[model samples]
Target: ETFVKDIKPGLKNLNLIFIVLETGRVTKTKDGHEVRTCKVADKTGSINISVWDDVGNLIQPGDIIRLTKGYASVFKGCLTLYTGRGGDLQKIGEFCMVYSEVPNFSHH
Candidate 1:
């Protein structure tokens, strides 16, 4: 399992579990697909993750999820998380977990 606090660019095939904090607007693609970004968090930290199509539509704040075979990468200069090929995002539970949005939430 990889924590948001330890994810780095170019990493792949990682397993992650967190709760959704916010979901961004779906950005339509001309190539015939839909994509959206969601902010999620765990006890350690939070980061934005890219979600596709129907998956984004089902996600909402407070839902705990399991992301199998996920990956991390740099997008527009910020670290972004992504689902990898053959992976699935599953909602495992609800608002019953600890999460921290602020990277350190204190002086570092």
Candidate 2:
């Protein structure tokens, strides 16, 4: 399992299994694509995740999700994790995973 703290920019094909810490508001893009901000983490750290479209509603706070072919990129000068077209996100289970909100690095 890849920990959030070990994640770095420009990383791709990242497979991470973690728990959802929290979720921000669901918004629509100019083209009408649904997007939501999700905070996910394991014991090592936490990071923001961009949940896209239909998938956003499927992932709930405290759900355990495993991401395949995930992508890490810089957005607004901060590290952001997202499942791009080639990637996949699935709800493995819920409430049985451990997580840490305070990552090794502070996140605004």
Candidate 3:
């Protein structure tokens, strides 16, 4: 599993981050209007991401997404990302393969 501690500036452009969904949906803007807020996570930490109306059609909760166009930024101690026109996501098909086994969810 990938972790944020492992992320460095060098890999930002070449490697795409495949983050697991922690939370994301509509929320209110500072002016008291509604806007979409997306939360995503990796092994190291979580980021509070934002997707505006233009990106609303492409992103969804519980989706395994590959970020193609965006960069991470920190605002008020909250990490946010800005996505422009090149973003996209495809539902991971049942036939798709992963090199990982089921995580051991049981804790003692």
Which one is best on TM-score? 2
Give the least accurate 10-residue stretch of model 2, judged by summed lDDT. 95-104
Clashes of each: 0, 0, 0
Structural similarity to truth (TM-score) of each candidate: 0.81, 0.82, 0.52
lDDT of 2 at 24: 86
Model 2 misplacement above 4 A: 96-108
Off by over 4 Å in 1: 95-108
**Model 3, poorest ten-residue lDDT window?**
7-16
lDDT of 3 at 95: 30
Mind giving the per-residue lDDT tens digits that candidate 1 earns over 1-108? 678898888888979999999989999889878999899989999999988888888988999899999889988887899988899788888765677688666766
lDDT of 3 by residue, 1-108 (tens): 345555443234322464546445676678766566677656666666566655555555556665655556666666665554565443452133469777788878
Error of 2 at 71 (Å): 1.0
| Tens digit of per-residue lDDT, candidate 2, span 1-108 | 688999999999999999988988998989999998888899999999988888888877889888999989998887899886887887888765677687578668
Pairs with backbone N, CA or C atoms under 3 Å apart (clashes), candidate 1: none
- What's the distance in Å from true for residue 44, model 1? 1.1
